[PDB]
């Protein structure tokens with residue numbers, strides 16, 4: 101029954117618009133297979149189309165906004181694109197139709213509506229780009245009846261081992277097709293749909309814009325050779341219309357020119373299924389997906405007071421659909437330094453300089469290939485897997501579809517090497533690499549990231565202990581299934597645990613350091629003078645200078661999260677020897693969090709260094725770091741330490757802004773200094789942990805119950821309303837929010853852990 105749920109999930113999720121780095125495209129969860137992408141741009145001149153054409157996601161003055169209005173990766177969804185430069189409102193509707201042995205069928209409708217500011221006679225070029233990778237696979241455009249291109253539909257017939265036989269149809273569509281009266285129309289036709297069928301080496305098929313432009317430039321070179329010149333030029337849209345040459349190859353370019361509004365369908369028909377997919381099929385499945393998406397949202401994300409209203413419901417659907425809509429499939433090599441240079445052990449003073457010397461040897465090499473199925477922080481800016489981000493992204497996804505979330509956890513944990521290391525940043529394949537400078541690509545096997553994926557496992561464990569509809573919840577509704585999932589992953593969880601304790605260990609025994617445990621102390625590897633990137637709080641102030649004697653209260657707290665998960669999953673698997681080891685490790689962390697990290701003088705937790713005089717010194721910087729034992733659920737509800745953190749959290753002069761908790765206190769010497777990334781702004785991910793723990797205390801007999809209930813109520817309201825106001829004003833989820841103005845700032849389309857707001861609104865933790 102585990103391998104049967106497996107096959108039905110594999111097949112449910114195979115197809116999707118799993119190219120979030122582009123406005124619209126499709127690929128299956130297979131490295132070397134069939135991919136599609138959409139391009140469009142207005143053409144007003146002989147030189148503008150190269151600047152107007154759209155393919156990879158960006159965010160600038162020329163784009164008002166874009167995102168999924170609805171999405172469920174089992175069924176499909178609807179994307180809205182609002183393009184100022186090209187004067188177009190586009191809708192891309194994608195739908196999956198189960199059937200056959202090959203992951204089923206799909207269809208997509210592309211609809212462009214010129215906005216009021218667009219010239220009514222605007223010429224828009226639309227390209228549907230189709231590529232297929234693999235040694236023993238075939239794809240052929242069926243030639244038209246007409247000389248110069250297609251009056252009707254374009255049919256591609258293809259085959260591969262992975263997909264079997266399939267047809268991909270690009271329909272004629274609705275919309276005026278411009279007609280040239282020029283001489284050139286005798287050789288190129290007056291204007292029609294055209295297809296170029298080409299071949300390139302498999303590994304460059306993803307370079308769709310260069311490949312298209314090489315064919316367009318070749319068309320213009322032919323105009324010059326053949327005496328079409330400035331005395332009497334063809335209209336621009338005809339100069340940029342490829343010569344029809346359908347055939348067989350691994351790249352097929354389908355080009356249309358429309359005057360005014362346009363629409364066309366893409367119909368992918370898996371031959372192993374019954375009858376082929378039609379446009380009437382597309383419209384019915386799109387209608388049904390919407391109904392289902394609507395019914396599930398109302399049950400899964402029942403927004404409670406004061407966000408019961410319809411305005412908060414549209415907001416919630418946008419933040420949720422953009423988060424789950426960001427899901428990509430990535431395949432390729434990553435760039436890893438496998439030297440394990442001894443400079444990486446960082447056991448000297450001034451270690452950052454040594455590690456820089458080791459990096460400057462550039463022993464990093466490509467390895468893999470790897471695959472990853474994951475949601476992402478931002479389509480235009482960070483369209484790839486970030487390890488601790490994915491913990492946050494999967495909390496609302498798991499509500500929607502626990503089986504989906506477990507697939508993504510499996511996918512991430514299938515990347516873990518023999519030592520227990522998953523790279524914090526998954527840049528898979530030359531396409532993923534195109535977006536990232538060489539210097540920033542290299543992953544380092546000593547660099548950790550918070551194990552936030554354990555929090556998703558914690559939520560799945562609570563659910564377990566207490567056919568698209570069915571598949572979504574098969575891993576909870578069938579307890580034998582849930583347990584086998586945990587049985588297979590458990591070894592990898594323990595491996596990661598051991599790897600933290602071997603590679604991210606702090607030094608007690610070597611200094612004047614008294615503490616209940618000689619063992620429990622942690623220090624993030626990878627820290628520079630001004631940064632600690634591996635903690636995830638890039639520029640949060642840490643001991644100066646950095647020092648092999650540093651201890652990091654956030655890292656110890658994360659190891660705490662890990663043991664508590666290992667306890668529950670070990671218990672469930674009767675792993676008695678382990679459950680007794682973890683229990684003794686948890687007890688030592690509880691004691692050592694107090695002994696190495698509690699400041700009675702300051703009333704909070706603090707990181708620690710070693711002095712110019714070789715003794716333990718607390719370095720206190722009041723902010724997120726200071727709260728970490730509380731954020732991570734480690735403190736008993738009667739703890740006086742908790743009571744002092746509740747005071748700091750509520751204190752307007754320190755962390756409490758009208759807009760949420762400040763990353764750093766207004767009192768800290770480093771508030772609003774340097775790049776000011778985690779040195780004052782409000783971050784939704786850390787506020788969400790705060791909101792969850794205030795609720796935990798608020799729904800329990802104890803001395804702080806009422807203080808917690810008040811802070812929970814107000815913080816939930818502040819965070820939700822701040823993100824809601826910015827969404828209403830700008831259309832965007834943002835990375836971070838300004839505690840002075842409430843403005844969203846830095847990275848837009850940040851869905852992204854900012855989408856946690858859906859879960860905050862729905863409460864009932």
Ligand SMILES: Cc1cc(NCc2ccc(CN3C[C@H](O)[C@@H](O)[C@H](O)[C@H]3CO)cc2)cc(-c2cccnn2)c1
Nearest residue numbers: 477482486487488489535536537540635636637638777
């Ligand atoms: C082309 C290029 C690449 C890179 N890569 C580095 C990078 C990657 C991702 C983030 C976002 N984010 C930061 C959070 O603190 C992390 O906790 C979080 O996990 C990650 C992921 O959501 C921040 C920096 C940065 C810039 C850039 C632009 C402007 C200024 N400085 N840098 C440009």
Ligand SMILES: Cc1cc(NCc2ccc(CN3C[C@H](O)[C@@H](O)[C@H](O)[C@H]3CO)cc2)cc(-c2cccnn2)c1
Nearest residue numbers: 480481482483534535536537638775777845846847848
């Ligand atoms: C004031 C402000 C704005 C924003 N906007 C988000 C952002 C993200 C990354 C880029 C870079 N960009 C990314 C593209 O993926 C590339 O294709 C492109 O080549 C490069 C160009 O070098 C540009 C904007 C981010 C920060 C910030 C602050 C601290 C840390 N991280 N980010 C601050």
